[PDB]
């Protein structure tokens, strides 16, 4: 404290009516109960997901932000409302509305509620254009899904989007999404426990092993959700492959582990042993506090894992505050 | 002072014609150079994967085990030999043929070379039979793939098999294979770095979260390859999902981390920090030295990682030999 939570999500107060004007049965809208405190995300006229009032409603969130030790919270879209599968124009039309909706959300208090914007990533131009229009309008950066939906980061198109954002000092949060294991992982929220970490790790490696970091300006500010999934733990596995296989080493001139200095992670790894190794790999300068609020699989006690750790005080302040102040340029 | 490597692979001297009897298209076979030093595993008339002499030649393997300081090696099928997609009776015939080759491989030196059996896992009745048969013939246990198409370890067919092995005191090594991810990970051996440790993690969580460990006798000796993939690192994320989501908790009565007392992992994580986490999670009693010999991205210097670690002499003895001697019953 100043305490920054850079990983959380919102959903806009849109009517099914307005949603249908985009798509009648594939654009998400928000159903609210009589007594406000509950509701649900809807796809068609049929329920999609039940949802906490904290997801929308900036006023209710602030009270929770006060109850948590949380001064500033960055929030961006729920992966559902991405729409990387729609027509390019309908998506870019949709993109702008959510981003304006996000600012109507951060209008309730623009000091404590910062917002990242979404792009139509299926269309490079519109994506790049939407990004600058939104960051200039007051969004602090961009949140993208981690793939789309079959050729991963590394794809020269997505590399180009990263160059655009890097050239204009646009910060990126990369979020795992649209996993991933097919017709498996049906129970116990397995996609969140197995697939999400894997997606996130895939995205990172796809940048390192393609040698994308050799072509992208160091101006690139890029953060990866959920501690970078399983990346930090499996890194030694990767270096070993790099050392014994020409194919792993062909587009990657340095040991993959060299590249940790070209990206950020959030701290959401839910375990002191694991947070320690994450910092050991990433450096205290490259780990930012994120909660994944207000999702049940997020951190309930926001900052509790960091504050309670055997990390230095120097390290704690950077993670809780220092790193996100510079990354997003917040003061 | 003895050294036991409990994770290595072999491939037998099968000719194109003998494999042709099983399947002209899908039966793997071995093509050796005239000198007898290079080799290729073939699928039908097609080149699958390049391999070298240590895979098939136990004389050449012994000298390599001599150079490496490994006293006793436990080896088992290369997963391409599984034939889980085949017609059952054909696959059962194959399994037996393969497991007889494995006895003949071990014949060169049966005190230093120990084998695990494969099974027609797609058919429970035949699988149990072949497991029993093979162990009575000299195998110290079974190696199975971690899944059968969309069947993960929580599937009743797979749980019945484990339950059989438990009752008959047959140890199991669980190996990742037939990796998820589709057309997504085609460069830099990404399926090995990303999908492989995720598969292994899914196998473990599938037993844990379905409550399968509550139904399977505590006598079951079961080990997971490559340190149980990313399991140990992402355990916190699991325990936290279990604590805040009833659908994650529904079939699993205890916190997922309590189940580390029901299984083992090999030590192949390629990083002293990762090894330390792993041991911290599993305990020095539940981690065993395995190299993934003789594949390019196994451990080239067998035992190097464990030996250069800050672990006590007591824990090193266990991982290097102690644990496997009791797990597999070796002298
Ligand atoms: Zn999230
Ligand atoms: Zn292996």
Explain the overall architecture.
2 copies of one chain form a homodimer. By secondary structure, chain A is an alpha/beta fold. Chain A has one domain (1-331): TIM Barrel. Chain A contains 12 helices and 12 strands. In chain A, strands 1, 2, 6, 7, 8, 9, 10, 11 and 12 form a 9-stranded parallel sheet that branches. A 3-stranded antiparallel sheet of chain A has the order 3-4-5, with no helix packed on it. In chain A, helix 3 packs parallel to helix 4 and helix 4 (124-137) runs parallel beside helix 5. The first copy, chain A, is globular, with a radius of gyration of 19 Å. The interface between A and B is large, with 59 and 58 residues. Bound molecules: zinc ion (2 copies). One zinc ion (ZN) binds at residues 7, 9, 175, 225, 292 of chain A. Chains A, B: Zn(2+) binds at residues 7, 9, 175, 292. Chains A, B: It holds the Pfam family Amidohydro_2. Chains A, B: Monomer. Chains A, B: Its EC number is 4.1.1.45. Chains A, B: It is an enzyme of class 4 (lyase).
End-to-end CA span of chain A: 11 Å
CATH superfamily of chain A: Metal-dependent hydrolases
Bound molecules: zinc ion
Rg of chain A (CA only): 19 Å
Count structural domains of chain A.
1
Class per helix and strand makeup of chain A? alpha/beta
What is the CATH-assigned architecture of chain A? Alpha-Beta Barrel
Largest interface: A-B, 59 and 58 residues
Instruction: Note the run of SSEs of chain A as H and E.
Output: EEHEEEHEHEHEHEHHEHHEHEHH
Q: If you consult CATH, what is the topology of chain A? A: TIM Barrel
According to DSSP, the number of beta strands of chain A is 12
Shape of chain A: globular
The CATH class designation of chain A is Alpha Beta
| Strand composition percent of chain A | 5-15%
**Helix tally of chain A?**
12
**Biggest sheet character of chain A:** 9 strands, parallel
Q: Which oligomeric form is depicted?
A: homodimer
> In which range does the helix fraction of chain A lie?
25-40%
Subunit structure (chains A, B): Monomer.
Keywords (chains A, B): Decarboxylase, Lyase, Metal-binding, Zinc
Pfam families (chains A, B): Amidohydro_2
Pathway (chains A, B): Secondary metabolite metabolism; quinolate metabolism
């Amino acid at each position: 404290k100043p305490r920054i939570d850079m990983h959380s999500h919102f959903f806009p107060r849109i009517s099914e009516q307005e949603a249908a004007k985009f798509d009648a049965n594939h654009a998400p809208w928000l159903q609210v109960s009589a007594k406000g405190d509950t509701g649900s995300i809807m796809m068609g006229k049929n329920n999609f997901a039940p949802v906490y009032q904290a997801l929308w409603d900036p006023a209710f969130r602030i009270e929770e932000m006060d109850a948590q030790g949380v001064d500033v919270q960055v929030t961006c879209a729920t992966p559902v409302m991405f729409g990387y599968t729609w027509e390019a124009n309908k998506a870019a039309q949709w993109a702008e509305r959510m981003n304006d909706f996000a600012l109507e959300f951060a209008a309730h208090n623009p000091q404590r509620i910062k917002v990242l914007a979404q792009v139509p990533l299926q269309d490079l131009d519109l994506a790049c254009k939407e990004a600058s229009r939104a960051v200039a309008a007051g969004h602090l950066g961009i949140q993208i899904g981690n793939h789309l939906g079959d050729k991963d980061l590394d794809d020269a198109t997505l590399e180009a989007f990263l160059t655009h954002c890097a050239n204009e000092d646009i910060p990126i949060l990369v979020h795992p999404w649209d996993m991933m294991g097919g017709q498996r992982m049906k129970k116990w929220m397995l996609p969140w426990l197995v697939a999400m970490p894997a997606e996130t790790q895939l995205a990172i490696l796809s940048l390192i092993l393609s040698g994308a970091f050799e072509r992208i300006p160091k101006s690139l500010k890029i953060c990866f959700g959920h501690g970078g999934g399983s990346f930090a733990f499996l890194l030694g596995r990767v270096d070993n492959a790099w050392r014994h296989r020409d194919i792993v080493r062909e587009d990657c001139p340095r040991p993959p582990s060299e590249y940790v200095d070209r990206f950020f992670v959030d701290s959401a790894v839910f375990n002191p042993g694991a947070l320690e190794l994450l910092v050991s790999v990433m450096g205290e300068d490259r780990v930012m506090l994120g909660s994944d609020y207000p999702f049940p699989l997020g951190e309930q006690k926001i900052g509790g894992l960091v504050l309670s750790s055997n990390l230095g005080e120097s390290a704690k302040d950077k993670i809780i505050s220092g790193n996100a102040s510079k990354f997003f340029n917040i003061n």
